[PDB]
Ligand SMILES: [Mn+2]
Ligand SMILES: [Mn+2]
């Protein structure tokens with residue numbers, strides 16, 4: 073049974089970049105719905121797996137990918153943010169960033185473009201290619217999780233579903249993108265990156 | 271050259287069901303963007319076609335369907351609503367509903383279900399299957415237009431992208447679908463239906 | 469644990485319509501590969517389901533849908549054929565066919581078109597819409613099974629993957645389609661149809 | 667207006683790796699069909715564009731990508747093979763391979779894997795990522811062209827549609843991939859690579 077992870081900060085901890093009403097709705101309603109529905113889908117899949125019912129297994133895949141991805145993506149998103157966040161990463165991460173994208177600034181333009189490039193619902197991701205030994209930017213639709221669908225390890229995710237910025241930025245997604253760089257918890261992204269080495 | 275069609279009513283004509291802030295943004299911002307992006311992409315397609323650049327034609331397909339479909343979908347959506355609508359449709363349309371979905375209420379549930387069932391951005395539609403000569407409900411992702419990607423003729427469309435309801439209903443998409451039944455322009459839906467019989 | 473179902477007839481039982489080399493390869497190699505790989509995927513999913521690993525669950529969905537669909541689709545396909553097959557169905561099925569598509573002949577053109585319309589790998593299907601109480605034709609890509617992905621109940625399936633006709637018909641898929649109507653086991657399709665009533 | 671390009675060799679020039687019957691059918695039937703369907707669809711798109719019919723433009727997109735991509739993909743495929751190829755590439759290309767994939771053998775495994783991994787119809791590609799300035803392997807479904815749908819520049823493409831090998835290797839797709847390494851036209855692949863450095 074999955075559960076809703078608490079927010080490492082208060083709903084208002086990210087103001088003014090991301091107002092309090094968003095954080096509250098996003099975490100308590102949207103994220104909670106994924107967990108609730110994820111646990112239900114898993115129970116039904118467990119049942120179908122025992123009865124050897126492949127047709128039921130398959131029919132349940134959309135619900136599983138959507139709610140599971142939703143749970144995975146958001147669990148990561150909350151940690152990718154911090155009221156103390158902002159600025160540039162330090163050490164190996166910054167070095168890797170320079171090594172793969174050129175400069176921290178070009179990295180930003182690339183991740184911002186990948187995030188702005190999403191038509192419909194989705195996420196923009198900075199990941200790690202274990203196979204290639206280097207960073208990599210990618211975009212996923214709806215709630216498709218990065219690792220489950222691309223093999224890449226998630227380091228930083230930017231939610232560009234409309235519920236993530238509309239109440240404050242309306243249709244101007246570029247402003248939300250310009251604003252979130254101020255709350256990026258590079259401390260956590262560095263953690264995940266370092267984890268990719270071991 | 272495509273143009274933004276004026277609404278058949280004022281931004282506040284659908285209160286309290288769909289507020290004026292949503293209507294103004296939806297039309298003047300979202301839809302207007304589709305129009306311009308549609309025109310630009312079309313012109314870009316004209317240059318690629320003339321130069322026989324198939325790679326460019328193909329790279330342009332996502333924008334064409336997204337902005338083209340966006341223009342098609344919302345143009346229909348505005349006509350599907352009315353400050354003097356709601357209730358049950360009159361004439362043959364209602365009989366088709368009774369015949370193809372059992373009853374008006376059962377019809378509302380199915381379209382509401384098809385609408386609530388969109389994971390991510392999309393539209394729920396009541397269309398006409400010319401081949402079978404009867405009504406048929408379907409859901410389309412993002413801005414994919416009903417007829418261009420399915421052949422069914424659009425009769426009634428329900429925009430379930432988060433920008434269609436978030437400012438008013440937040441995450442409660444079912445509250446938005448419940449309210450919209452009050453402003454359905456049955457007259458226009460009947461017109462479209464009869465057209466599939468011209 | 470799934471197993472490879474025996475063929476209701478010998479590999480040459482469908483000549484000349486579908487030669488023996490196809491039937492043998494199709495059943496013993498292609499179909500057998502699905503079963504082998506399906507059982508493996510299910511074991512891995514069972515493991516991931518216990519560890520609460522959603523990322524692994526999701527990553528395994530493509531393998532599960534492809535091999536499970538492959539196992540479901542082909543198990544049905546073998547029964548949809550018969551050396552004694554051919555002709556038109558009788559009783560309720562024929563009646564339903566006339567009622568939903570007009571005539572047996574128009575039904576054929578529709579199923580043939582849906583089958584010819586498949587770009588890439590896939591199947592053409594005649595199914596039953598439990599909700600609507602009537603027949604319905606649809607097409608599925610690759611090994612996506614009918615019921616698991618559309619809710620429709622499979623009655624007759626026509627495999628249009630290239631391995632199903634290339635050795636004999638090469639690129640002329642229309643000849644394979646024209647030929648298979650001679651081996652359609654209407655007795656089995658009638659069975660599945662009647663099952664949809666109960 | 668598009669035309670079927672002549673092969674740089676005779677239908678039997680690739681024996682025993684890819685037999686003459688496959689080469690003749692692949693080129694004279696499959697590819698030729700893409701060309702004509704591409705030209706017809708393009709002309710149909712011209713009429714829809716002129717009449718500003720967005721629904722028609724969109725309904726035509728599947729044929730355009732399928733026949734357009736089919737023409738793009740096979741035109742490249744013919745140039746990727748040679749009766750005087752095989753072995754290891756010479757010059758910078760090989761060094762890039764060593765650098766991006768570890769070694770030539772490791773490169774073959776990854777592309778062979780990406781190729782065997784296509785479920786249904788598709789292509790396995792070795793492309794160049796201009797943004798990152800390095801090699802990158804990717805797989806594309808059906809006839810979706812590499813550059814038009816991913817931005818990567820095609821260097822080497824391996825057709826894994828069943829018509830590319832069935833008449834000779836039957837279901838044993840791995841035997842076909844193993845054999846094709848003997849006719850890779852490294853000279854052409856190097857040319858394409860250097861072009862991403864012009
Ligand atoms: Mn979100
Ligand atoms: Mn909208």
Ligand SMILES: [Mn+2]
Pocket residue numbers: 494498542627629631632
């Ligand atoms: Mn098959």
Ligand SMILES: [Mn+2]
Pocket residue numbers: 692696740825827829830
């Ligand atoms: Mn081919």
